[model samples]
Target chain A: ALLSFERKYRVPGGTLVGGNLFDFWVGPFYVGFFGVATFFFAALGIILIAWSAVLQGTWNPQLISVYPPALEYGLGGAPLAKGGLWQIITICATGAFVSWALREVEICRKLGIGYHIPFAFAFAILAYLTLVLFRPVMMGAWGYAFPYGIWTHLDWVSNTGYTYGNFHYNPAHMIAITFFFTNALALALHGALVLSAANPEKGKEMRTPDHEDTFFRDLVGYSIGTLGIHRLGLLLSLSAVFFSALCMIITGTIWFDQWVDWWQWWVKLPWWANIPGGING
Target chain B: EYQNIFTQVQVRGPADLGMTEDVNLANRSGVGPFSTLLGWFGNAQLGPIYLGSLGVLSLFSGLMWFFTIGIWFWYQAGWNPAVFLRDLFFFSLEPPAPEYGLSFAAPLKEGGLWLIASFFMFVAVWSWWGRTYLRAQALGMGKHTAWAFLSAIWLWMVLGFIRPILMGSWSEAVPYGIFSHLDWTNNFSLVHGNLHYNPFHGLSIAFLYGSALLFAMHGATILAVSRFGGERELEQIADRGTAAERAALFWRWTMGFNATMEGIHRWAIWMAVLVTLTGGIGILLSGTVVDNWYVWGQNH
Candidate 1:
């Protein structure tokens, strides 16, 4: 099934972290060392999740849940029935995710292209790590992390949110929320601007970013411009996930007060105290 | 603050809140909504009318929906219909501070409009501009270029929809107003310690500013090459190769390493996404996760 043009990009000998033993293509699929590892971990992880479901005596996707170790276990490994499977599954999942990213790296290397794909995927991995590994370790309990379930994870978020008064009070969460909102605004402008350039009312030739820039400048007195918008988009998205991790981790290990109570500092400000009431009022 | 405010003060009635009023209500014998509808189906023996009827109806319907819902939301925010129309269409160069009761009902209603309008606005942009990506895809354009657009839609969905649910109140969404939104951000920030002192918020700002810098470099670079000409009588044209070379040389002279034009684009896209993404993470997580980021940082 190899097309005639396939050989042009089929350059070899750019393997990182592995030898040529597994560096071959099966059909169209590249079988690098990491690819092999990816397959292995993915299979293992899926089997384990299924096994846990069987142990729970349910095939229902909604009811099947994998709980981490009890709070008493702390960072210690748990027994198989007592969240050991969950721990191993976590390890397997991380392994698979990492391996997949590495596989992307290897592919990029072979194609002699930039590693943007792998780099972007790495952020996703980082976000996941923040949730399961970073947050759990910081909180000093494996049980602090969410369970692997359809409904259970939601329950965990609710429990955790109320655990710290109201989760909305968390400042990082608000910022993250805003980032998500702003990101939407930026992308909308970018998409619309690009389309406006590319498609004109029939009979019009394709316009350049000049037209795009001019449109924004005339309308809003500014345009991020064509290339600028993309860069803005990248920054907005990665920051969202990065702060998402930060927001969750800081809930227990750092802050242990109700969100409303956090405002007491402003209420007690000296400059505002000089007035009959606070500056805010 | 009061001293400066005194210098900038201008006497005005409380009714002048960025509103204007002017409209000819009486139309001298035109196709009314019902008439247009009747005419659409009345002339069954038609050719272009049948073809163009749907388009005409949709245009009117869309405008009607936009204005009707928009005015309704304004009314919900405690503005009268006339005042709302004036504020929206005609500006009096004056800012109004309209006061409403402190119940969740008012804030929630206003915030709900903000959320809905913002969400729809994002979608409208997507549907309108995403057509370019669609066309490009048909011509064998790589799909990776479309990621930023999709990411944007998803971002709004999370911020506009998901976050409000998490907060358990629509009132958590910012109200729809130019100055009001700014006040909301400032007040929201000051709710804890100084929002500026919040480390993650600082990171978001830094990233946002950094994104601007990256964009300036990118746009400047592109413009430098793209706009290499003189007046019409004695114009110059640098071909693509020469322009690209000039761009490469400019970077080489300025920054040591001359990244390829393609490389610069990749860098630019990543930079933009990171800027907003971090800002999102930083602000959203601040109050919800850490109570007082300033205090936390001081302790650390």
Candidate 2:
């Protein structure tokens, strides 16, 4: 659905590459160089994935899967059947996603809008890269990258979690869950406020932010203004991704056991040690 | 206590004066699908507060229909059909045994029931995220809420997908049953010699409690300011200023200084997010860095 507003604001000269060669729109779609690149890469990636699925000889959605190289491959190359297809696919996927992001930036520049949209999308790309690229490389095996099956990947998570013991023992995992939950709760309250405030009786005018401030001040002795609550909302979510990234990066870079042992240094402090015969004993 | 005592001493009942007369006040004021209808009785000297409100009847009918229909799931367990009549509300559908690992098992008796449940759970949550995106788009609203939900999905996938893949078996994932999941959590802490001692766990808890406090403050504040048009308080550039001025002064008097309608949310967000980030760090470090949190807490 092409909107007149976008066409009204359209301006030229924000091309990052290829000069004005591809700086045009077909119908409602922009055809910048990065968009072209993204299209090609995405097309190739999907084609390769289809080929792999065919190789497995299953039309069943759940049965179709792709895996990384074996541990022995150790960042080396492999044949098509063996994770080489996966490598090519990964590169294509990365190229497509990054290109799409670049296209967004170019569009923002042309439209004279903020770059926040593309920047946030970039974080998602980064997180995925951290798993498929960074972590796998750090662990010295393409095999460390997560597999590409629905239930298959979950099995990987279970095994990885139990490898050291329970992932529930992981404090990072807990906080990640907590941040997510807090974010949800905040949104719920925000929705309640917006719904009730914005939707007044047919004859009545909508309530003002002043009323919101009054409400919070009366109940909790304070209020986060509209902008302030929004800012926190952004931060709450971004931090959620950061923590998710942090947990896996930790797992990939340094493999170990029992998260409790890290607390050992704390347990041994002379002030807390009491008798020094060992705390557990 | 007074009602029971009155009944016992009034000569209408025996000395015990228990059971039927002791109406549960569990629902108190809360409303939810989870709370039982029979649990909401406000038993005072007046004898189970009059059901003047439609909700009381609604509460009674809602739970019975839901709880009874829910037992239909028990049929899938393949237990003798009649056996489930009593056990429907109480029985659990456990996950497949660890021996099966990531593989499938019999749908009725084994953990296959969980796979069915988990997939449905996954679909519902993810589908709702799509709903948020679609609705936001339709309303000319930014996809901010949708994005926030995506972050949640991100972590959820990590737990159910990434972690399991890395670890090599789906069996390591948490169970789907209510009691079974709680039991799993208990077993986990016990296995670690005490997860309570974990530093990240402490941080997570602190963040969670802080989040709880912030939520209460916000909800109470919003609800209380209703008469003052507090709901629209943030959007008011026109600023009648009556609602806002009174609150700032009230808060300033109570605490000497207030959060200026901007800083409190900022403060709470950091506190809230840190719960996850720090808590995540703890989990990531678990088995990777720390071992025994009891000992770790003692030393570090």
Candidate 3:
């Protein structure tokens, strides 16, 4: 099966395909990457769940301390005690059991061949980065300024800009990081679509006897040679990435809602004051 | 009038409810329509224009499916020129870098390649609306489009607006925008009436109401399926072992969806739901306890 799969699935060779020809050598590498991405998201979700139930109940009067109520809620105020872990387990377990049930009943997986290549995409990029640049950038260490500084500043001003708290600091980098996963998935899906279109046996499944006209033939050619991936998914995912990225840009802005002091009565922003009532500054 | 109150600056987080929060726009646009729409959920605040921008993003979300597939294919096809090598005499295969030589930067440097790629993509996906719009024709499902549009509106409206309500009028200190100039206030003591404008209070509701909506949607699905004599299917739903089968499916879907829906939107929704419920319910339950609890009775 492995030999047959390789023979049937292998792409015609070129410089692009020949770079170390490592697809054959790196199957485990891909799997490990996917596992890390999935586990990271899962762990984050688990932390948020724990923070909500156990910590929120016992420590409400004291209140959790963290930046952005969202972050505080997601990571802070999470109960660190054994009781909290139990609640976390319950919430997570319930969720897993239900998802399993949904899949078993053919709800989520019922649609046309549901393959979660997002993890696969996430894994590939991370693996490459780890191989090439081993420095790890985790979430908590990230302050908000990276995107507005590095990504935006490079696009706009200086090539290498200073990093700050919001983009590099906040959860914003995750949004940009998600783009790598999305682009990778798009590549894979396109590969699948093209492979399906180009192969004789696979081609048969993609079309019906009646609809095999020149238009579809062209579609297959175009899809295989070019647009075979579910680009719509890519577009939607990118939009999300862009929107999220933009928010990341703003997450650090002083004018939006810094809430750093969390005290003293009055609140103000220098730029915002210039407009109408903003002159009070 | 609403424009007069909010000087056309992009305000995130909660409004201060003071003159400082107001601005004027030459054009007519009001946060009132959105506030009114979201009033059912609670004292929603992100306003219509903000919600409207979100709705546009959501519509774009659905529209992107075509581009990813179509534009990428166009990209690969025209990315490089194929090369062939041949030798006639003895025994060697000589490669020729013949016509239209390839460069690694060719794809990167192609003129209007991105634009042309986008155009072909839009054309290919029009049949599905994605398809229809690409083809300049109506492919039915107009109702679905309307629903999706409205869903986008509600998503932003219900979720975004709730942030203010959760954070409270004072929670205004917390800014959602990175460029926000708003400074933080120090007094956050509940006794001093300095309520901790923690949006974390809203996460509980995120689990509750967020799941409640999903449960209702998929809950109805289970209901319909069971109506068709598919009671055996209910077992899987019951596998979660919570509430009735339909309700269990709902919780399952909601929890799965909720856990995965990370990022600012997730954070925003949590902020909104937690605060809105806590603030709104706290206000209601405080003075008019019977009246507020009675409102719950009215629903039941």
Candidate 4:
């Protein structure tokens, strides 16, 4: 049975596109317009992947991969057996991800809340797009897109990293890695700060956000406070993935030189010529 | 004595500490009982008087204390002032291990400077903890505030004190420098075939991300109700009741449950502590425990 409070909050008519046709719930799941799209895309994408696996004569997870067309295809679409399946799958994945975010939007609208959940999801989508679409498009071929395989994707990363002569040397990659690291730091502080207040030993009184603030303040001499920490986390993680996208995008497209060689500019300066160390030497 | 009591007290001249003569004007029309004390420094009848000497002394002491440690560290690190003057300011690299030495300026053994520097840093931080703890107590939140500070202190203790001792060399500790310290870390990581391959680093990194996720959710959820797409007066922002309820509702709407505002914060603190402590662990295992982490990984 639906709780009384749930019933109170379950008012209808905030649908974005489908006017009451799909605006209903199946059990607890809301089946809005985007939900229909999400289901359709996800189902199709999975089927395509399965069909490709069968065509490739492999059910083994490690061996399965949906590779893009050969470089000779040159930004053109390939036949279904070649890169076309990957292209279609990419479209479906994008569709599914977008539709899912839109579903979140609908839910948020129904609740009269801000679109934070969808906003955050967009970053994940951006990261995926960076991998499959943005970076490949920048580099002038869908062939550059990572093969969609559990192991194949990793191989792509290792290959791509080596292609740049050391991915760690990429300045953008370094920033992304750092942001990824610091994101953890922020979350750790926020999570621990929040839980410490939420759960206390049995028979003890509950705490407030002031307690949370004071905890952080006591340790770090400052707290982003409850609201501020969210802002920091959102910025940090979104920037992190966004930078990761940039880091990958820049690898062959923007900078073709080895990452180790990127540091040569520091030694080539005019002032450094007078020092004991010279560029040629 | 009766005439002296009736006579008006006055300051003949400026002075330090107590006063040369009684400046008491307790019975004066403008000087109330409380203002009588104020009258001792200057004419309270004219306006409010500020005793600047104590404030000046405090500022002076603080500056002196900072420079004392700063200059000492610079000296012990073998950084010269003339080079600093030439460069405007320059970050010095660490001396090679063979050249690593201690001075008589500090009455400690090898790595004494490192230990003493760390100790000084700890004292400063611990004192800050004391200050915050006292302030939190004032806010009636002493117990809640202690964990974050203690976790931080523990991380420092692990890195600065415990790890070096475990490794059996003071030189294993990071040097005091902007660039040189990074060199130490780089060298440390290199000695172990890159810290990225270190399992503890991986664990700590995960916790770090975990910490960020918690804060991102909690903070964003709270702010969603408070500020995002909503107008809030500064007073409303600061108000305990409305903000808390809104934040709770925000989380409920977003995550299906509030996790209660307090629960989110509590979790954040623990995550922070875990990440920090685990990071300390990763460094501790750098050379002694795991030599060449990548190779170690493959062998295991």
TM-scores of chain A, one for each prediction: 0.91, 0.89, 0.25, 0.93
User: Could you give the candidate ranking by TM-score, starting with the highest?
Assistant: 4, 1, 2, 3
Which of the numbered candidates is closest to the native, going by highest lDDT?
A: 4
Write one digit per residue (lDDT tens) for candidate 2, span A1-281: 33322334445767799989988776556768997998899899888888889987987776778888899999999888899888999999999989987886676566443354455556668888988998888889999888887546755775677675656546676666666676645754464444433443344465554444433332222345553454445545556657777788887477476654544554445553343221121
Docking class of 4: incorrect
Once superposed on the true structure, which residue ranges of model 2 sit more than 4 Å away at CA? Answer: A201-203, A274-281, B1-300
lDDT by candidate, in order shown:
0.54, 0.55, 0.28, 0.59
Sorted on lDDT, highest at the top, how do the candidates line up? 4, 2, 1, 3
For all predicted structures, in order, the TM-scores are 0.53, 0.51, 0.23, 0.66
Query: Model 1, residue A278: what's the lDDT?
Result: 14
Model with the higher lDDT, candidate 1 or 2: 2
| lDDT tens digits, residue span A1-281, model 1 | 44333465556666776678777776666767887898899999899999999999999896899999999999999998799999999999999999887876676556543444455557768878888899899878888878999657756865787677656657788777676656644644553444444454355555544444434332232344333344455556667667877888777787888764675564445654333311122
Compare the candidates by DockQ and give the number of the best one.
4
Per-residue alpha-carbon lDDT of model 1 for B135-253, expressed as tens digits?
33333323333555554444455444455556555555555443345446656765866565566556655555555445434433443333332111001211234445444543332
Top candidate on TM-score is 4
DockQ of every candidate: 0.02, 0.02, 0.02, 0.16
